Design a protein around this ligand. Structure first.
Ligand SMILES: CC(C)CCC[C@@H](C)CCC[C@@H](C)CCC[C@@H](C)CCOC[C@@H](CO)OCC[C@H](C)CCC[C@H](C)CCC[C@H](C)CCCC(C)C
Ligand SMILES: CC(C)CCC[C@@H](C)CCC[C@@H](C)CCC[C@@H](C)CCOC[C@@H](CO)OCC[C@H](C)CCC[C@H](C)CCC[C@H](C)CCCC(C)C
Ligand SMILES: CC(C)CCC[C@@H](C)CCC[C@@H](C)CCC[C@@H](C)CCOC[C@@H](CO)OCC[C@H](C)CCC[C@H](C)CCC[C@H](C)CCCC(C)C
Ligand SMILES: CC(C)CCC[C@@H](C)CCC[C@@H](C)CCC[C@@H](C)CCOC[C@@H](CO)OCC[C@H](C)CCC[C@H](C)CCC[C@H](C)CCCC(C)C
Ligand SMILES: CC(C)CCC[C@@H](C)CCC[C@@H](C)CCC[C@@H](C)CCOC[C@@H](CO)OCC[C@H](C)CCC[C@H](C)CCC[C@H](C)CCCC(C)C
Ligand SMILES: CC(C)CCC[C@@H](C)CCC[C@@H](C)CCC[C@@H](C)CCOC[C@@H](CO)OCC[C@H](C)CCC[C@H](C)CCC[C@H](C)CCCC(C)C
Ligand SMILES: *C/C=C(C)/C=C/C=C(C)/C=C/C1=C(C)CCCC1(C)C
Ligand SMILES: *C/C=C(C)/C=C/C=C(C)/C=C/C1=C(C)CCCC1(C)C
Ligand SMILES: *C/C=C(C)/C=C/C=C(C)/C=C/C1=C(C)CCCC1(C)C
Ligand SMILES: CCCCCCCCCCCCCCC
Ligand SMILES: CCCCCCCCCCCCCCC
Ligand SMILES: CCCCCCCCCCCCCCC
Ligand SMILES: CCCCCCCCCCCCCC
Ligand SMILES: CCCCCCCCCCCCCC
Ligand SMILES: CCCCCCCCCCCCCC
Ligand SMILES: CCCCCCCCCCCCC
Ligand SMILES: CCCCCCCCCCCCC
Ligand SMILES: CCCCCCCCCCCCC
Ligand SMILES: CCCCCCCCCCC
Ligand SMILES: CCCCCCCCCCC
Ligand SMILES: CCCCCCCCCCC
Ligand SMILES: CCCCCCCCCCC
Ligand SMILES: CCCCCCCCCC
Ligand SMILES: CCCCCCCCCC
Ligand SMILES: CCCCCCCCCC
Ligand SMILES: CCCCCCCCC
Ligand SMILES: CCCCCCCCC
Ligand SMILES: CCCCCCCCC
Ligand SMILES: CCCCCCCC
Ligand SMILES: CCCCCCCC
Ligand SMILES: CCCCCCCC
Ligand SMILES: CCCCCCCC
Ligand SMILES: CCCCCCCC
Ligand SMILES: CCCCCCCC
Ligand SMILES: CCCCCCCC
Ligand SMILES: CCCCCCCC
Ligand SMILES: CCCCCCCC
Lengths: 231, 231, 231
């Protein structure tokens, strides 16, 4: 395990996701409100899935070698397995907060699936120049998602409770900033142009992942917006 | 890319799915009705997914070699990845049109999953005679789906709005004819008996795919059946 | 096929799932009640999926070799493909019976996904001692599911119809006993410590699978709890 310099960040990531999972699990024990239960379920599952995939990367299972540029390049494929399930759960948290219509939710989840799926294909593609074609398609799917979060959701939040409108606005802003960093790190890291070494890349993704999951969850689950308006 | 004679049909397929995706995306921009949004979301996602998988076939990612009959046989596995997601979306379009009950929808999607999954296993099976066992099981799942579309849905459409009944009937008929061709092409093509060469097989699937997705979508999204009855 | 001593149990399993599938399919033909249709759909799909995966194991497709302990160890990976889809369907049968809230259903299905997914990783892991780390995480996800079935569902059933409360209690008890045997068989069988040989392991899983699917389904589909209260 320690044979890879990036192991320290995989281990820290595993620990922080594990701790985040346990914290949300305990916190949600005292919850009976049916609406709050939905948000706790979604939000606890996110770091639990990430915990398993960080562990698989730490132990070496979630790593494969991909030939491109005349080299055997270490590619952590387990990231995409994580993201396939956790990024639509994160979007679902946002969509339920603002009572999004079903068509909009399906558009978001579908675009998200395309985003992660094409990122996976790009990560595993052996023809170097083609990796960036997949990156571009994935990034276009991301831009669609960000567009919807701003010009379909923000003006939906404003007709809702003030506490859900303010909580949505904060989580929207956190999401757009954090999620936009992922394609940049991929592009300059070992999957793309290879300018930033894998150990630093792994650190960067770990900070983004913990912030986008445990950070996000801490903000959401401390808000009164997750509860039905009750006396 | 041009090293494979079937590349021209993969390229045309990619282009037509891409163009179809953009057309539906633009067309649905001016839509606020919650019901119509569902149909636009579902129907736009279908060629978008197909676009990505056609591209993966064009670039060579979605192709593998399978030993059977003492030969290395080129198998485009990306078709099944496409179909796994797009065929239940197509069925969902039909089921929502007639306000199908939840049990019926689950039966359809489940049978569809079995249909595509067993087709994939058959496509990748190395014992030649066993490929046709999987083809038979998949075809039985197809026949179940077609049965339900006729003797569970058609008489559901007739108690609904005339515009939804007439639109459903047309899309049902398009679906049954087009979908029934797929097992025949598989059986006589490079996956099955090998009587029709891969380049012609690829052409045939491209015509079926564009018709079943973009053709289907053009009929559906031009109907007033996708809108709630409103003043 | 007969080259593997466990083939007889794979063949019997295939037959019993096939027969169970046909029986439930015929039985549900005379059903119009929308609630009952849901239970028939879910419950018929379960042995149908299991039939396909038992067949893939019989024909040899669903088997791979995994190096650990200095040996090539036969691992039937198709079990996890089965279980990935059938165990959440089984939980859905239980959850719908007691009209579980959406948050609880998502927690169950999510924990179940983690349970099966980590079992799959453990089954395919090449470092022997690490296989048991994945077994432990999977078992913890199982224990969560069993906890919810007892201390979240049982007291939900009691405020419902007596026929649904009594049917739920029986199916809950069947589920907890049968499902708890699976991690034990894995641990002592060819995936784990290797004390029980593969042919006996295969027998054990076949008895558990038929009981947990066809047995379970026979109890559920003969109950009046699956019908809406109607005059
Ligand atoms: C009911 O609605 C609220 C339940 O949501 C909360 C439900 C949770 C989503 C349940 C899912 C967590 C499972 C219990 C997962 C089990 C293994 C976990 C990964 C635990 C890992 C952390 C520990 C090992 C440090
Ligand atoms: C509604 C939304 C969910 C829409 C989803 C959007 C989605 C369509 C976007 C594209 C997804 C698609 C790229 C998934 C591809 C998975 C694939 C990378 C798995 C690895 O297999 C690739 C090659 C080795 O590189 O296998 C070597 C050759 C092997 C023989 C491969 C044969 C097995 C195939 C992988 C079977 C395909 C199954 C499905 C792709 C399962 C989807 C997995 C998940 C990653 C989407
Ligand atoms: C809101 O409900 C309506 C939105 O549906 C319409 C929503 C669409 C389903 C959004 C999904 C499309 C994504 C934007 C996919 C991005 C890449 C596409 C494959 C674009 C490819 C076509 C172009 C490259 C020729
Ligand atoms: C409700 C509905 C959805 C019901 C669904 C119906 C469904 C049950 C029908 C059968 C689906 C099942 C056949 C999927 C099999 C996928 C498999 C072909 C992927 C390729 O792996 C096959 C061999 C190489 O040929 O791998 C070589 C050996 C490797 C070590 C394989 C180990 C990895 C396994 C593939 C893990 C299994 C994961 C699940 C099958 C994911 C499902 C993928 C999708 C195609 C259904
Ligand atoms: C409508 O709601 C009730 C339908 O549920 C019942 C619907 C069923 C879930 C339909 C799914 C079964 C498909 C017809 C599967 C076809 C192949 C089967 C595996 C048949 C195998 C058994 C036989 C070959 C012995
Ligand atoms: C809401 C709930 C559903 C939550 C779900 C919980 C879930 C997160 C729990 C963990 C699931 C995760 C372990 C699935 C891993 C599948 C993996 C074993 C498939 C086989 O690939 C493993 C190695 C060979 O051993 O591939 C060799 C290297 C290859 C290059 C691998 C590259 C292809 C990757 C497999 C692509 C990943 C796609 C997704 C994992 C699809 C999920 C399949 C299913 C088994 C969950
Ligand atoms: C918890 C993990 C999260 C929130 C991950 C988010 C990841 C993305 C938004 C990834 C986006 C990518 C692209 C837009 C193109 C390049 C490849 C990706 C997959 C890194
Ligand atoms: C957009 C793509 C569509 C509508 C594809 C439909 C495909 C089928 C109905 C495929 C059916 C098959 C069988 C019935 C058995 C042989 C294998 C298949 C998968 C080709
Ligand atoms: C129809 C099949 C059923 C009901 C299978 C149930 C399987 C399980 C509950 C498996 C549990 C496992 C663990 C808890 C850890 C070890 C690995 C598994 C996957 C066997
Ligand atoms: C969105 C953030 C992307 C920028 C990442 C900056 C990383 C700077 C680290 C120094 C680069 C290491 C190069 C020498 C090894
Ligand atoms: C459902 C349509 C299946 C029939 C396809 C007919 C294809 C005819 C093309 C000629 C066959 C090529 C054989 C000589 C290369
Ligand atoms: C939950 C049941 C697990 C116990 C399984 C008992 C199997 C006993 C069979 C005898 C073991 C075979 C060892 C000699 C080959
Ligand atoms: C490819 C995996 C996509 C599914 C991820 C799980 C999250 C799905 C959330 C469903 C949202 C509800 C839509 C109506
Ligand atoms: C194996 C992939 C199956 C899922 C495909 C996505 C479409 C699912 C549509 C869900 C229909 C709603 C059922 C209640
Ligand atoms: C990884 C596969 C998980 C999906 C299995 C299919 C069963 C899903 C049942 C959905 C229950 C409804 C939740 C709201
Ligand atoms: C186009 C929608 C406006 C809100 C999205 C902001 C786009 C940020 C760009 C992210 C950088 C990705 C490379
Ligand atoms: C049995 C249901 C009647 C409607 C379905 C028509 C079946 C068409 C056969 C398709 C050919 C597949 C090989
Ligand atoms: C902790 C919840 C109480 C009900 C679950 C009973 C646990 C049975 C243990 C199963 C054995 C697995 C190794
Ligand atoms: C070796 C790099 C070749 C450049 C490929 C860039 C493709 C980016 C596509 C953006 C439309
Ligand atoms: C393919 C990228 C699309 C980003 C711009 C959004 C187009 C308008 C969509 C309106 C729902
Ligand atoms: C080499 C071909 C052997 C014939 C197999 C046909 C099987 C079809 C099954 C239909 C019930
Ligand atoms: C070779 C076996 C080494 C023992 C591993 C047991 C790990 C079990 C983890 C339970 C917390
Ligand atoms: C509760 C702490 C969980 C941390 C387990 C994984 C950390 C890796 C240590 C090497
Ligand atoms: C908008 C046109 C999209 C076409 C891109 C793929 C066509 C392949 C050209 C070689
Ligand atoms: C209807 C009987 C189904 C049995 C088919 C599979 C049994 C395997 C026989 C070798
Ligand atoms: C993006 C950083 C999130 C910070 C989380 C802090 C949570 C405290 C309530
Ligand atoms: C099956 C062929 C479909 C033809 C689509 C034409 C759409 C015009 C409205
Ligand atoms: C766990 C054993 C189940 C027994 C099923 C018998 C069904 C008869 C109604
Ligand atoms: C990591 C366990 C958290 C302890 C409880 C925190 C207050 C709910
Ligand atoms: C008003 C919300 C500001 C949140 C910005 C957080 C940036 C990481
Ligand atoms: C809305 C601001 C987006 C900031 C992008 C930051 C990418 C590192
Ligand atoms: C391909 C872009 C379509 C242009 C608009 C067509 C009329 C909505
Ligand atoms: C009355 C509907 C006829 C549609 C037939 C289309 C055949 C491709
Ligand atoms: C309902 C008519 C079906 C026609 C099947 C055509 C197969 C090529
Ligand atoms: C296996 C076929 C079952 C025959 C009908 C049983 C009574 C519904
Ligand atoms: C009162 C229900 C008892 C069911 C026990 C079944 C054990 C297999
Ligand atoms: C509730 C009793 C569980 C029995 C476990 C049996 C495991 C073989």
């Amino acid at each position: 395990i320690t044979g890879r310099p990036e192991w320290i960040w995989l281990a820290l990531g595993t620990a922080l996701m594990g701790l985040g999972t346990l914290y949300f699990l305990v916190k949600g024990m005292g919850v009976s409100d049916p609406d709050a239960k939905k948000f706790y379920a979604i939000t606890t599952l996110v770091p639990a899935i990430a915990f398993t995939m960080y562990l698989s990367m730490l132990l070496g299972y979630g790593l494969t070698m991909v030939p491109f540029g005349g080299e055997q390049n270490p590619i952590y494929w387990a990231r995409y397995a994580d993201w396939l399930f956790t990024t639509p759960l994160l979007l679902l948290d946002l969509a339920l907060l603002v009572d999004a219509d079903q068509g909009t939710i399906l558009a978001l989840v579908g675009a998200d699936g395309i985003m992660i799926g094409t990122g996976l294909v790009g990560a595993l593609t052996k023809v170097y120049s083609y990796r960036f074609v997949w990156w571009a398609i994935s990034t276009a799917a991301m831009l669609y998602i960000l567009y919807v979060l701003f010009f379909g959701f923000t003006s939906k939040a404003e007709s809702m409770r003030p506490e859900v409108a303010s909580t949505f606005k904060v989580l929207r802003n956190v999401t757009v900033v954090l999620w936009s960093a992922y394609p940049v790190v991929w592009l300059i890291g070992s999957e793309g142009a290879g300018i930033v070494p894998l150990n630093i890349e792994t650190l960067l993704f770990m900070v983004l992942d913990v912030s986008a999951k445990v950070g996000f969850g801490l903000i959401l689950l401390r808000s009164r917006a997750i509860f039905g308006e009750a006396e």
